[PDB]
Design a binder for this molecule. Structure first.
Ligand code: MG
Ligand code: MG
Ligand code: MG
Ligand code: MG
Ligand code: MG
Lengths: 512, 493, 519, 519
């Protein structure tokens, strides 16, 4: 009559559905990470504090817009708000900082320093009109556009609002017919579905933004418009040695990214289902197919996946989501998404706090509604037989956690790897990852179920006593957070020697 | 490389997900019914005609608003639009008419006799201080006003969420076992009006117990005994007593609008999947309703969440999906219908039929009913040969419904001479009803043949299959069987 | 419930299915696994053959690695005399198939003191001589053993092991002459006439089809046998050679390849693809390969035959102790039941009926065990796996067949009635392994006899004249099946059965499935 | 992938798992199924028992039907002399359990011509007089048979069937006297001394514990036996009486209930709850109930024992023909393999080792078959179903045990090493049926011997002194287990093993799993 445990015992998925119970309350622990895009509505320290309290785990900075000065101040405010809670190591929550690249974006020029259906529109590459745009002349930044489009090509403007069809293709210009009508502003996004755009994966702009991210000690990079594995390698190369620990999340936003997903996933640390641009590049009715394919393959490969964009779109103006938006968040969790994201809802909307609180509430309910019986069985069957002791330890810990309905899986980890390997098998119980590495604690939010706790206690002289100290630290946090209490059973993962790579010990212990 | 047939062969659901292919186009036939609420934006004959072309199968009239004259004119326009195609039974599409009752609604009064006060959080409400309600019959309980806009807690009330309060607004009592009658005097008038207007189904609002369903059915009387009663589950009590409600009903609507105010909004998806699962298990139609494409009221394209919501409702197992404001008052009713059509077809191909068909059979009883065995045998044959359609001759629809309960991939072309049977068939996933108007032939074998060839001609014209394809045909074995018990696997002539 | 292990049938796991098996849950009347009996001195008379048919014999096996053509002709006449003794009642008449077991590249001994039934008792440590002198081919005794492998001394050496009669007696070559061998008995035992000799690891060079086999195979065609059990099939080319000898008139004779050695197991897939069926010939197999590996080969071959939809026979030593005892051992009871649970279409008796003291009891015991084991099958998993492992088809009869089996499970039908001329339609139903018996109505006598090769097919031979109105001819044959099922106790009026028929006269057009209450 | 049927292990269906079984895929060295051998004249000497231990014997089963306690004490001493002959090498020492079979409500005949090993040949149709006159208790012959059930003339009539020696000989009462019966032997056979007598359908009211059993059981406690095989257990109260006779001094002796008649099968659930394990005693069972139903009772009982996590023994006539022949029949090879596939913890040999001509060959054959069948288990389905049928628990050892088995599958572990005092921790691992052997390290000699009751448990008895530092004591026992599988060929460097220990010295708190590469 708890955590949908009655539905958990069903021998079929259909009966599992039939047993879902609105009167079965979920656990306190929320496993799905919440990523919030920071903007004018959420930039202040005071609002950022409320965002952390409401459930924000990752702050997303969109380098689509804004100077390095602007984003540096945003990062300072995020850390000021985050460290405001540092006086309580028990209740302190690490907050990651993510850098979303601009990438190969196509943007229009400045209007004069209403498009109508059927009219003719010239697309100019001459910079003398880079700010002199009007209903008859439109300047764009893609200099080699005439080489990659034809008279049959479609051109979309302003997040798919305006549709254009090339009617005559020149060498330095394009003539199009308006398939919309509508109102065009300045520096709007342009989409070229099906076209083989030859813009660099890492532009000159992308190079300094990524180097700025390395300088500012960001935790992850959301790389826009990844089209092939070599694109990912370029991003990782730009990050270099100093950036080698930054997680690379490839954003799949167009047809080519979907077709080359397998090679992209193998080269990346994770994936974002960037449904905003994806829904303009492919038919909107096919987006759920691409979303479920990518989440499935990420679960199968054991790499984090983010579901993004328009999840609670109506809350930009309203304090409540629609029923479809509630369903979308829950189904993304049921699909298997490690993280869910808010864009305009937190960047510019009128109710950023309510949007964060809503994603937290829905995620907790959906996590309990997961059919773990089938999921764990299928994840194990699709994962290979290994000789890695940590991998065998991880699956034994998850199986043990199901057998005793443990309150938590406690994992000591330096790099996060040991905890990621547990999360890959999707236990119902939260994974309390104890680390002294602040970046590991922040990066842990990318992975479903990992509740990172940052130990700041000095290293104890006896290593066995230092390990014990950190295990007891996890117990105290879990009890204070209400994840479990004394007498409950938890599973504890440690290694046989100091350092990374040696997690091989599972203990089933009552909580002291 | 079509209809996600690669994903269909996966040995696990996880691998089935991994194999979903945006470049795998679906079949032409769309199996999920589309229910459109008719209103000012969709009331004209010409608009209703275009909605039929765009995919509308059921016209829903919401009797929470409007006079009998207004709805009678709406019904007349629907029948005028529907009957435009009656001169060609091959291309004629039956369109059902549904009556959504007002039900036990609680409504406030008029603001100081007029037709707004601004309530402030923490204030007392018991004008801005005086609130009258029409519900004539504890502390800490929650009372919500105007589609959940204002929240109040009984203190001995205190405003929990403030807002601008109008006149005669709906009131919701979450968790309360309200004792209002299931059928009000207004509901009796509307239901008898529905009987006179020959409606096909009733969407009964705020059904709270099995006895509520029986009370509705009694009002429909003798002529209405064949009208399908769909119980709308909209509050906590309906969810808790769902099982007795389902067995007493002909179908279920997940009325997520009111449900999301009566129970925490983050719990609605649990109730939806529970109800669709139990309806799938019982073989009774289930409707997913409300705010599925809400943004399309003002925009020609839906949000990413709205596309997911429609697709996941089909994957859940919903027989029908519904549009309310999107078609009743929105600016893009045709685009909303067309979008539900497109998404449903893509989602229908993405169903994991291997597990679904296996689990539906394991959860269905061993029976001695020859038609139940015939239906499951026909669905198995349809999967084995990838048939273009399952053709079913039926008078009441029962034989076709029994096929639909086992959820074949192929469309079910149900041939009937009963117009009400054809219209009501839209409640069941996959049933494409066609109304034969040819006279009954003296030789019974030729009457069956006449109707089978009618189905062949319909499928060819609709693009469901062509000559040479393989279909399954369910008929009877003799004149006056009374039961469908004959399955034939035949090439299309 | 409380019948045909229907409680165990509803279990969500195979383990719980095991836990629910109930010795007090009686099976149905219908027995689905065919019983093949080897005919010999103990079972040759018309009167005994009549009782063998009554006790459950479906196929009579004649082993042509022993006996003359005249001798076997009289046996065939006796089998058909006994079979046609029941012809005066077409409702209760049971077709009985005749099987021809080839000699193949077998090494066979001679006659003990001029008789095929005599035996001598070999004792441990004694000396035995193997001679190739054809003067001793019928003068075998405790001191002299003649065999037919002329090049035997070229492939054996001193200390080598030679086994006789399915590995029963082991002999060690002690001296190697040019045309003879003298041996020592390592384990004692009692040796009969024309027994098999096994040389494991020896490169035996005998042809797959000998000159004797050509004569025997043509004799089977002349005598209108229903199937050929081809001994020691080692490769697909062996099967093709046999099929060529069978010619055009034998094109309808089912070719069952016997897998008896290492090569047959390793090349099983190409052998199965070329054959009509398979016999797990465990007698020779259990000495040619390690005895502890035979169950692996058996379950592999039964599994692959089930997967391909071709009949598979489990054979030899199933009830071996009943050659001398009226009740079997516990291992023998388990062996028969597990062969059925493995998925074997037919089970076989060799010495138990050919020469044993209790041939009727052995047939009855296989009948009793088979019926109990068939109810104990976990049909829920089996039908599910057969369908997932079977391809999507364009054959209307294949889709009709799988739909009929699903319907049979859904309504727990008393039978699936199938009208068929060649048997194919009934075979396609049997491949999906319904619990209900498949009553195959045919006017083709060979189709009726050959149907015993397929699990669950109860053949009935209609002798009524072909009716002019084809709809009335179909009804005539369907009602004939109703009459048989009622008389046999498979169902009664009010029960539900499934009926498979065609849309037109001829073979190949089964496409109509009806779920009908029994009239 | 070409070893231990790992290709078949990966199949998505049981049908495909069967299809992939490969006679050319060799199993691992470790054999998981325990082998129980009944000791008798053929296996009583110290020298023979030493060869039996090397061939694979894990448990010596003693039936005290003849001889004084002094005679049986010498048998026990001889077993332990043979067992301790290998003690000079703790690496290769194998613990050997001793089992005691109660007489129970058994009816037993007398001595053939004064000897326990003499036999007479009964012939079909002859007359055999059954007498209760004690002057013939040791004077049995082909014409006079004495048995110990004094009330036999009260419970049979003229025409009744009387079976002797597990149904081998059948007799029909032709005349009844006050204290004698004149019977006719229906089938002939060889009649030995002190054979069991079965009276199917007779209302025998004999006690669960006879007076002979009271003396023998306390003698067994004095002789430090490890387990008791209680005959003809019919209800839970029967088990309680056995445990009461064992008393406090015997409280650690495991009681294995033998199910041998209808009531034991029908009341199985209450018997299992009161017992430490179950023996499927198919000898008496196959004559008390219809022989065609025995496989149902066997698979039901093994399934329910697997579900409960209690040992189950499959017994009797598994290799019956090997009493006289050096090679088993094909049915006997199948029976042993299918008992392992069913899920039996132990398989047993009775006459094959007690009196047969080839006791060593019988032991080696059970070892060979068991190893092959263990690789052929469909672990994917078995582990899934064992977990689904086991409840969610709060016991840390249960969660640790299932996590260790899952880890053993994930890395294809060479072994699961378990430190245990009472055996419970190792028993809890065995309940989830890992493919890898369970090396249970104990200092308790009785725990080591009793561990043979559980599938997969390879017991090793540490005799090294207890170390002051507990971490060194755990290390000593863990690496001792390494050295054994190391030397036995169970694994080599690069393989992965799973190690189960506790957090401190004590009993009941096994909660630590370590995944370590083999040094
Ligand atoms: Mg960006
Ligand atoms: Mg984008
Ligand atoms: Mg409502
Ligand atoms: Mg042979
Ligand atoms: Mg016994």
């Amino acid at each position: 009559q708890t955590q949908q445990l009655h539905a958990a015992m069903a021998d079929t998925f259909l009966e599992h559905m039939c047993r879902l119970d609105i009167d079965s309350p979920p656990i306190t622990a929320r496993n799905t990470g919440i990523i919030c895009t920071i903007g004018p509505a959420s930039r202040s320290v005071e609002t950022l504090k409320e965002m952390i309290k409401s459930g924000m785990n990752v702050a997303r900075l969109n380098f689509s817009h804004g100077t390095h000065e602007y984003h540096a101040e945003t990062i300072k405010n995020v850390r000021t708000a985050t460290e405001s809670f540092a006086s309580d190591p028990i209740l302190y929550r690490p907050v990651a900082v993510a850098l979303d690249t601009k990438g190969p974006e196509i943007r229009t020029g400045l209007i004069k320093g209403e498009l109508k259906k059927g009219a003719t529109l010239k697309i100019t590459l001459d910079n003398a009109y880079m700010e002199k745009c009007d209903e008859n002349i439109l300047w764009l930044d893609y200099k080699n556009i005439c080489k990659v489009v034809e008279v049959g090509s479609k051109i979309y403007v302003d997040d798919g609002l305006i549709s254009l069809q090339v009617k005559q293709k020149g060498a330095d210009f394009l003539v199009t017919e308006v398939e919309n009508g509508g109102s065009l502003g300045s520096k709007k996004g342009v989409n070229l579905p099906g076209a083989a755009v030859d813009l660099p994966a890492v532009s000159e702009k992308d190079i300094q933004d990524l180097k700025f991210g390395v300088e500012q000690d960001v935790d992850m990079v959301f790389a826009s418009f990844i089209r092939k594995a070599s694109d990912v390698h370029e991003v990782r190369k730009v990050l270099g040695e100093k950036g080698k620990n930054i997680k690379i999340i490839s954003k799949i936003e167009n047809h080519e990214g979907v077709r080359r997903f397998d090679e992209i996933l193998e080269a990346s640390d994770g994936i974002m289902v960037a449904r905003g641009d994806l829904g303009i590049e492919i038919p909107a009715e096919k987006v759920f197919l691409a979303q479920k394919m990518m989440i499935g393959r990420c679960n199968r490969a054991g790499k984090p996946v983010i579901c993004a964009t328009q999840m609670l779109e109506s809350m930009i103006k309203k304090p409540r989501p629609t029923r479809a938006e509630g369903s979308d968040v829950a189904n993304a969790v049921l699909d298997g998404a490690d993280c869910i994201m808010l864009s305009g809802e937190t960047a510019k909307g009128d109710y950023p706090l309510e949007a964060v609180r809503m994603q937290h509430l829905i995620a907790r309910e959906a996590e309990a509604a997961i059919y773990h019986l089938q999921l764990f069985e299928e994840l194990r069957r699709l994962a290979p037989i290994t000789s890695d002791p940590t991998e065998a330890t991880a699956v034994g810990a998850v199986e043990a956690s199901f057998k005793c309905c443990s309150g938590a899986i406690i994992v000591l980890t330096k790099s996060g790897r040991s905890a990621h390997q547990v999360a890959r098998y999707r236990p119902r119980a939260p994974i309390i990852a104890v680390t002294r590495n602040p970046q590991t604690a922040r990066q842990a939010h990318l992975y479903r179920g990992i509740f990172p706790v940052l130990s700041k206690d000095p290293v104890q002289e006896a290593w066995a006593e230092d390990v014990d100290l950190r295990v007891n630290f996890a117990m105290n946090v879990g009890k204070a957070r209400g994840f479990f209490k004394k007498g409950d059973v938890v599973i504890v993962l440690t290694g046989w020697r100091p350092g990374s790579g040696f997690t091989n010990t599972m203990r089933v212990v009552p909580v002291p």
